Amino acid sequence: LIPEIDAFLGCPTPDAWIEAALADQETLLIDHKNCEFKAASTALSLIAKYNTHLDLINMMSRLAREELVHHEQVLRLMKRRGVPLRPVSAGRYASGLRRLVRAHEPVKLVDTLVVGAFIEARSCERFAALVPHLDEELGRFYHGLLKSEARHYQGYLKLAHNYGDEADIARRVELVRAAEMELIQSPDQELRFHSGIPQ
Amino acid sequence: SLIPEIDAFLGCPTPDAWIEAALADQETLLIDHKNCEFKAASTALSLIAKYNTHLDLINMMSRLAREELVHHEQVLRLMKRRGVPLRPVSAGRYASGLRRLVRAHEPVKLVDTLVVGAFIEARSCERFAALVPHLDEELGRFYHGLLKSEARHYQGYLKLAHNYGDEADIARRVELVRAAEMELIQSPDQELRFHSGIPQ
Numbered sequence A: 001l002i003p004e005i006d007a008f009l010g011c012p013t014p015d016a017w018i019e020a021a022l023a024d025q026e027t028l029l030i031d032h033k034n035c036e037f038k039a040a041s042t043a044l045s046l047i048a049k050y051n052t053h054l055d056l057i058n059m060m061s062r063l064a065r066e067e068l069v070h071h072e073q074v075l076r077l078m079k080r081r082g083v084p085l086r087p088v089s090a091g092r093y094a095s096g097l098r099r100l101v102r103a104h105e106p107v108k109l110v111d112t113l114v115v116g117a118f119i120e121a122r123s124c125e126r127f128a129a130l131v132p133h134l135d136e137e138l139g140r141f142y143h144g145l146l147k148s149e150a151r152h153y154q155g156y157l158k159l160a161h162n163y164g165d166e167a168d169i170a171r172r173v174e175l176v177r178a179a180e181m182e183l184i185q186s187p188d189q190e191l192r193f194h195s196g197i198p199q
Numbered sequence B: 001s002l003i004p005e006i007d008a009f010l011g012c013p014t015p016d017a018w019i020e021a022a023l024a025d026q027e028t029l030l031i032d033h034k035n036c037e038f039k040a041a042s043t044a045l046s047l048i049a050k051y052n053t054h055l056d057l058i059n060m061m062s063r064l065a066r067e068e069l070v071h072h073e074q075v076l077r078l079m080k081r082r083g084v085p086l087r088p089v090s091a092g093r094y095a096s097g098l099r100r101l102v103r104a105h106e107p108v109k110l111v112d113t114l115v116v117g118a119f120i121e122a123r124s125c126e127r128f129a130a131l132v133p134h135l136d137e138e139l140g141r142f143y144h145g146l147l148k149s150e151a152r153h154y155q156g157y158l159k160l161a162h163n164y165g166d167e168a169d170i171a172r173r174v175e176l177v178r179a180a181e182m183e184l185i186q187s188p189d190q191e192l193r194f195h196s197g198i199p200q
């Protein structure tokens, strides 16, 4: 039935992360831009690996296009606000979750899709947490992205059920949820969209 | 303008022997074509990640990747309507043979990469044009729409190469890739792919 976002997630975005993000919105926007790109890149990696899974490929191709639209939309917002194209390395979050995916098919694919649902669900929750503190234009933008993330979280989890058993997805969601909460609540060195709490 | 016409830019026409082989296995051709549209988008994203502060490149490649993913989905839709199942079709030799020509150090590595992209798109355009007289109406109409986009992408790759490179250096990168590209197209090949040589 797909749980609601806060139910699905193991913890709220911490206040300390919101404070850090509001104080460095330039790094936030750039890593946000990179996350949209990486979502599209990840979608295409799934097409490449599961290259005769027609349901997956059709969903992923369309998902990749929507994320590239978001990618371009952040670049245009950066241009409007004079944010420079500054290199920002990937954070620990997605690769930390990917470590949990099992090595053998078909549960390898199932685990990968569950991780995708968590990343989208956290993005939705975190956009929601930021909106009331942002200027009008950026809050409206992030509130607009909030609805697409909810759809993407639902899609990943639904695609997981198209390829895995209910009981096997249940255990996997429980395992990722615990690790995801740890990544969000533990201290992190720097500000990323999906980073932990700063020191 | 030094964006030549497609046929002038290219070192040879598509051989008749390739057309004959393509018409006898349009199912492999369609599947490989679908993968090529996919591979164009993934290459565009690969360029974005590698050249993550080249702003003009990123804006072009992001839109280009979306257009190629639309083409990817369009081939899939056409395959579904015609009952063409998916099956594994490994990449051919063409693009990998061309990428071996790219020089190893920047900024000419980027320039050479963009030149190679221009040749891949120009060849696609020429080869679609060679095919459509021989195809059914629906397939020909679809391939003709793609041919026009390929002409645009060829121009875009070449324009981006000049945006980052000097005219004289590009001019002789093009001369070297052109000779290799003609060799890959005219020489015998062990398989049929959209960009294969002459199969046997």
Ligand SMILES: [Ca+2]
Residues within 6 Å of the ligand: A006, A007, A008, A009, A010, A011, A012
């Ligand atoms: Ca919760």
Ligand SMILES: [Cl-]
Residues within 6 Å of the ligand: A018, A019, A020, A022, A023
């Ligand atoms: Cl603050």
Ligand SMILES: [Cl-]
Residues within 6 Å of the ligand: A065, A066, A069, B066, B067
């Ligand atoms: Cl699009």
Ligand SMILES: [Fe+3]
Residues within 6 Å of the ligand: A036, A039, A066, A067, A070, A148
């Ligand atoms: Fe997005």
Ligand SMILES: [Fe+3]
Residues within 6 Å of the ligand: A039, A067, A120, A148, A149, A152
């Ligand atoms: Fe998303």
Ligand SMILES: [Fe+3]
Residues within 6 Å of the ligand: B037, B040, B067, B068, B071, B146, B149
């Ligand atoms: Fe295309």
Ligand SMILES: [Fe+3]
Residues within 6 Å of the ligand: B040, B068, B121, B149, B150, B153
């Ligand atoms: Fe193209």
